[PDB]
Structure 1
Amino acid sequence: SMSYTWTGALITPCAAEESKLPINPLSNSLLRHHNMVYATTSRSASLRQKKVTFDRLQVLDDHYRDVLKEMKAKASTVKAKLLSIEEACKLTPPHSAKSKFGYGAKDVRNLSSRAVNHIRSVWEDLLEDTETPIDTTIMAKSEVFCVQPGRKPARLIVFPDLGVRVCEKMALYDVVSTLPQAVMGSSYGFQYSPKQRVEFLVNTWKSKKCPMGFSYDTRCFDSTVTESDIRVEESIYQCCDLAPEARQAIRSLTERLYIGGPLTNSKGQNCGYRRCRASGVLTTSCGNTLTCYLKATAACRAAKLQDCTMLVYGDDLVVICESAGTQEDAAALRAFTEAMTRYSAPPGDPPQPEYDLELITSCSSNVSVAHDASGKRVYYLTRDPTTPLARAAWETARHTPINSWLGNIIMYAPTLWARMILMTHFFSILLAQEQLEKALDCQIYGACYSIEPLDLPQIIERLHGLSAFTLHSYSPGEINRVASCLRKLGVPPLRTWRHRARSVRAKLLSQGGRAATCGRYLFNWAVRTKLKLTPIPAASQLDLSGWFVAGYSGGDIYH
């Protein structure tokens, strides 16, 4: 079966599409090579349509079936609740795509009678009709990148109407929030804050006599997900204790939405048919994580990899195991790839065995080492800053729904690039515009959060510990990756950022209050006569319940 079939109608935009970085003094202070930065548009959609459209080979074996039974035995411990209409409505992002049936996200959030009435009729239709395919919209996603030494085509998103999305929450929010950890335990990546993630990786690595690890990159994961995969996923959901309406909603959503369905473009034209995972549904993250875990765990057994520990974030997979020696690891890994290939999940680039933890990439990130105020080694996660910086420049010049920069500051807070460049740049702008107090939207593990920049110190402390504000003596490799990135993009060198930060820090300290705390903690690296930093009282008091429970990419979730 084909992942997609197409009619010939175009994937169309619903408004003008910007593709060039504007020439703006605020973005230009950060990044001068503006022609290197682009945004994708619907104009490249057909290139992506070609990449994501292919026949799927799938042969299931005893290892797969054994693993699946083990996962279902754990799912059987779960009791999931049906969410009320009110709770589902309050999970809807304020700017979520309006319904085609005369109401939008604001109305959903306000519980207006039209929205509520339409959501109830959608729920009742899920209970009564177990087969009719549910409509979806296909759109090209606009994302910002740096040009390569050419251009990435737009990614495609597929999502159902607002009424359906609210019903998905009712039936499945509790399931997708609870079941993955119940099934996958320590392997489930969305449960970990950044410090907890680094500790898991480092401890797993140090728990092996002679560790070997690898990442495994599936080509076009969503498109490799077969109808069988999606029914297997439902078989796992169905092991939960479920309200009978939830049980029917899940069965109906699985047949009418998740397995596939018709695609309509923005103009209302029939565009094609999907027989693979939709990116824009509540179960995308959970389903992808279960599927990846199932396939990878069974393939580890087929390959005879010894004492495997996996970390899974949707389609993103890392495996750390005991080395059997260079040649035998190389052979085992190739056997792993062939087993995954049989399960429909062939690799983009063949996986490579790695004998150094810092050379393994999970979620484009690697572990690196710096030192705290006392000289003690601290492990932290980092990445190549090229895409974060390109995106930060875009978001400086253009008001954007989700601020990637804020997510990058929060999650990569210990890195030299987030600290020296992103904090300096964005605090400088917020100070000048007197917007330090204005709540901004970002996305953390797929969910949308509204965050005030002035709360950053206590958010960073909780997620990373106080060492985040004292790291120094970064590794030569990391320094040289940042420095070469800055040269490439026309970003001023680190010495310039140090000068700018000292100025920002003084203005913050002069303001007192929460702004002075930002100066003291976020910019202590900028001064030689350091302030002695103690736990922020507000940190222990922060409600970070629901931060690192699950992933919700594509799932239209707001907290």
Structure 2
Amino acid sequence: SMSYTWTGALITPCAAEESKLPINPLSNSLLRHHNMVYATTSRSASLRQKKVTFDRLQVLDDHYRDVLKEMKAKASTVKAKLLSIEEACKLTPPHSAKSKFGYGAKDVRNLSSRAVNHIRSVWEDLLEDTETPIDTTIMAKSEVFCVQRKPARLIVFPDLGVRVCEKMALYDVVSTLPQAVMGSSYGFQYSPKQRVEFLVNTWKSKKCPMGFSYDTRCFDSTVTESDIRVEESIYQCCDLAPEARQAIRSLTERLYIGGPLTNSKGQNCGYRRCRASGVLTTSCGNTLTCYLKATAACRAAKLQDCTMLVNGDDLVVICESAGTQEDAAALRAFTEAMTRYSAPPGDPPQPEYDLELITSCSSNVSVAHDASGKRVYYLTRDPTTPLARAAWETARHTPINSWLGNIIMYAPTLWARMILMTHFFSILLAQEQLGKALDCQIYGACYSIEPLDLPQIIERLHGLSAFTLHSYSPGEINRVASCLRKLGVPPLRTWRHRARSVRAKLLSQGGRAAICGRYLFNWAVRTKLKLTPIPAASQLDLSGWFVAGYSGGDIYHSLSRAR
């Protein structure tokens, strides 16, 4: 069936859309080539629509059925809880899209009578009606990139009341089931230092390793109605409350497998028969689907001793080499199997024999040295998109601060330390906002984080070595320096000067600012301050941070205030 059908009504914006980086002194201090930075808008939606619309022709085989049964046997160990309306309301981000039924996210969080009554009505309707398709809105996503243009991605999501119901039925399932089923291959269970450790140990565990990333083209569009029912069959192996079982059954047929698309103006836009990006099961469902197809495809291809790492549609496989020619042929066979399963490739995969040459979640393992000169592995990435987005976030207030998520996840990197920490600490210190909580996203869930708490967060996620790395690889330094020239970002020497300046000011303030000056900017001086474990680090409650993925799932993981 066709992934989408369209009526001809346009994908419309709900307000004016900005596509150009503003010319602003603060952003210009970071990046001078403002014309290279753009944001996608609804104006390119038609180009995306063409790319994502195609027929799927899936063929399943014994390897696929075998792997599915293995996955279901592990899912059969799970007991999932139904969340109460209160619990589910507390997981709603404060800025989540309002309902068309007369209330918004703040009303949901406050347990307002109108919100709760409506949510209860939507729940009862899921229990009673197993068929009526649930409406969804389709919008063009606004994302920032550097030129060399990408057309906007399309997001599809149901009303706020439905989203709260999805949490009640499935939040515990999508939080617990993926690890139970996929074990160590489930990527979202790892903090950054744990992900590096898994990749390095997996690589070194092979006698003669070979690895590869597999890029599926337009993954969400490749997901079939069969795939979404197979995913449901895995969820149904959990012990579930009867109302949760019915809600899952109803949501599967009424929302997850497909449904009508309405634009921002209320016009009937088309019909979807593939994965919606903006529902609670997207991350878990995609991960399970990718894992199932790939695990089966590895068997078809006769790849030996595979170990996969999967996060949504992002897949990396590390196996035992059978020799160069044998590996090349096996990878072609793997791709052929994936294609039969409706997961055709974007870039054809290539075998790699160096761990550093593999890219997963757009990141690669690199090496630096700590204060003692000992090797430390850490994950880095090309900093182009992070810097372009940081520039946009400097000129405009945005709902998610990618820069803060990037400092958290990429803290050990040369570019996050020299450029992102320096730039934002400088501006926030001047504005007396070092302690103002900002929203950021980690594995798709939203968190409200005060930049002054960064040192202890970094220590937990990466280790104290994140504050001492030096002697970065020549390859990594070259990629950063090349990026800076391309984007017109000032050279590293300028960043060192700015860092010494903000470091002095932070130290002068005492308190949490001084801990930031000491730990975050020790790299900027020769006269190192002593770094010890931060007392606050051991008390940090990071429960919930690296448990599961929730991208598109409308999840907020910070604490709800008492009423």
2:122 alignment counterpart: 122
Determine the C-alpha separation between the residues in 2 that align with 1:101 and 1:307. Answer: 53
Determine the C-alpha separation between the residues in 2 that align with 1:131 and 1:231. Answer: 14
Determine the C-alpha separation between the residues in 2 that align with 1:111 and 1:535. Answer: 40
**Which deviations, in whole Å up to 9, do the C-alpha atoms of 1:411-469 show, x marking residues without a partner?**
00000000000000000000000001100000000000000000000000000000000
Determine the C-alpha separation between the residues in 1 that align with 2:76 and 2:158. Answer: 29
Determine the C-alpha separation between the residues in 2 that align with 1:299 and 1:532. Answer: 52
Shift of 1:259: 0.2
Determine the C-alpha separation between the residues in 1 that align with 2:218 and 2:526. Answer: 48
**Which deviations, in whole Å up to 9, do the C-alpha atoms of 1:155-206 show, x marking residues without a partner?**
0000000000000000000000000000000000000000000000000000
Is the partner of 2:212 in helix, strand or coil? strand
1:57 alignment counterpart: 57
Determine the C-alpha separation between the residues in 1 that align with 2:516 and 2:174. Answer: 36
Determine the C-alpha separation between the residues in 1 that align with 2:271 and 2:55. Answer: 14
Determine the C-alpha separation between the residues in 1 that align with 2:166 and 2:20. Answer: 37
**Which deviations, in whole Å up to 9, do the C-alpha atoms of 1:272-309 show, x marking residues without a partner?**
00000000000000000000000000000000000000
Determine the C-alpha separation between the residues in 2 that align with 1:21 and 1:262. Answer: 34
Determine the C-alpha separation between the residues in 2 that align with 1:530 and 1:351. Answer: 45
**Which deviations, in whole Å up to 9, do the C-alpha atoms of 1:484-537 show, x marking residues without a partner?**
000000000001100000000000000000000000000000001111211001
**Which deviations, in whole Å up to 9, do the C-alpha atoms of 1:29-66 show, x marking residues without a partner?**
00000000000000000000000000001000000000
Shift of 1:540: 0.5
Determine the C-alpha separation between the residues in 1 that align with 2:46 and 2:86. Answer: 40
Shift of 1:74: 0.2
Is the partner of 1:157 in helix, strand or coil? strand
Is the partner of 2:276 in helix, strand or coil? coil
Say whether residues 1:382 and 2:380 are aligned partners.
yes
Determine the C-alpha separation between the residues in 2 that align with 1:301 and 1:119. Answer: 45
**Which deviations, in whole Å up to 9, do the C-alpha atoms of 1:369-417 show, x marking residues without a partner?**
0000000000000000000000000000000000000000000000000
Is the partner of 1:378 in helix, strand or coil? strand
**Which deviations, in whole Å up to 9, do the C-alpha atoms of 1:201-240 show, x marking residues without a partner?**
0000000000000000000000000000000000000000
Determine the C-alpha separation between the residues in 1 that align with 2:225 and 2:207. Answer: 41
**Which deviations, in whole Å up to 9, do the C-alpha atoms of 1:130-172 show, x marking residues without a partner?**
0010000000000000000xx0000000000000000000000
Determine the C-alpha separation between the residues in 1 that align with 2:302 and 2:492. Answer: 47
Determine the C-alpha separation between the residues in 2 that align with 1:399 and 1:314. Answer: 29
Determine the C-alpha separation between the residues in 2 that align with 1:38 and 1:130. Answer: 43
Determine the C-alpha separation between the residues in 1 that align with 2:303 and 2:104. Answer: 51
Is the partner of 1:505 in helix, strand or coil? helix
Determine the C-alpha separation between the residues in 2 that align with 1:57 and 1:375. Answer: 54
Q: How does 1:276-295 map to 2 (within 5 A)?
A: 276-295=274-293
Determine the C-alpha separation between the residues in 1 that align with 2:21 and 2:237. Answer: 50
Determine the C-alpha separation between the residues in 1 that align with 2:6 and 2:56. Answer: 16
Shift of 1:249: 0.1
Determine the C-alpha separation between the residues in 1 that align with 2:23 and 2:115. Answer: 42
Determine the C-alpha separation between the residues in 1 that align with 2:53 and 2:364. Answer: 31
Shift of 1:538: 0.3
Determine the C-alpha separation between the residues in 2 that align with 1:259 and 1:106. Answer: 30
2:465 aligned to which of 464, 467, 478: 467
Say whether residues 1:47 and 2:42 are aligned partners.
no
Determine the C-alpha separation between the residues in 2 that align with 1:5 and 1:370. Answer: 50
Is the partner of 1:59 in helix, strand or coil? coil
2:301 alignment counterpart: 303
Determine the C-alpha separation between the residues in 1 that align with 2:23 and 2:73. Answer: 57
Is the partner of 1:256 in helix, strand or coil? helix
Determine the C-alpha separation between the residues in 1 that align with 2:143 and 2:251. Answer: 29
1:225 alignment counterpart: 223
Determine the C-alpha separation between the residues in 1 that align with 2:330 and 2:170. Answer: 38
Determine the C-alpha separation between the residues in 2 that align with 1:211 and 1:261. Answer: 44
Shift of 1:119: 0.2
2:313 aligned to which of 312, 315, 338: 315
**Which deviations, in whole Å up to 9, do the C-alpha atoms of 1:336-371 show, x marking residues without a partner?**
000000000000010000000000001000000000
Shift of 1:317: 0.1
Is the partner of 1:19 in helix, strand or coil? coil
Determine the C-alpha separation between the residues in 1 that align with 2:151 and 2:348. Answer: 22
Determine the C-alpha separation between the residues in 2 that align with 1:504 and 1:78. Answer: 50
**Residue-pair matches, total:** 557
Is the partner of 2:55 in helix, strand or coil? coil
Shift of 1:24: 0.4
Shift of 1:248: 0.1
Is the partner of 2:70 in helix, strand or coil? helix
Determine the C-alpha separation between the residues in 2 that align with 1:322 and 1:506. Answer: 51
1:195 alignment counterpart: 193
Shift of 1:541: 0.5
Determine the C-alpha separation between the residues in 2 that align with 1:451 and 1:67. Answer: 40
Gaps of 5+ in 1: none
Determine the C-alpha separation between the residues in 1 that align with 2:81 and 2:530. Answer: 47
Is the partner of 1:348 in helix, strand or coil? coil
2:140 alignment counterpart: 140
Determine the C-alpha separation between the residues in 1 that align with 2:204 and 2:434. Answer: 42
1:112 alignment counterpart: 112
The TM-score, its normalising length taken from structure 1, stands at 1.00
Is the partner of 1:350 in helix, strand or coil? coil
**Which deviations, in whole Å up to 9, do the C-alpha atoms of 1:94-149 show, x marking residues without a partner?**
0000000000000000000000000000000000000010000000000000000x
Determine the C-alpha separation between the residues in 1 that align with 2:103 and 2:427. Answer: 36
Determine the C-alpha separation between the residues in 2 that align with 1:62 and 1:19. Answer: 49
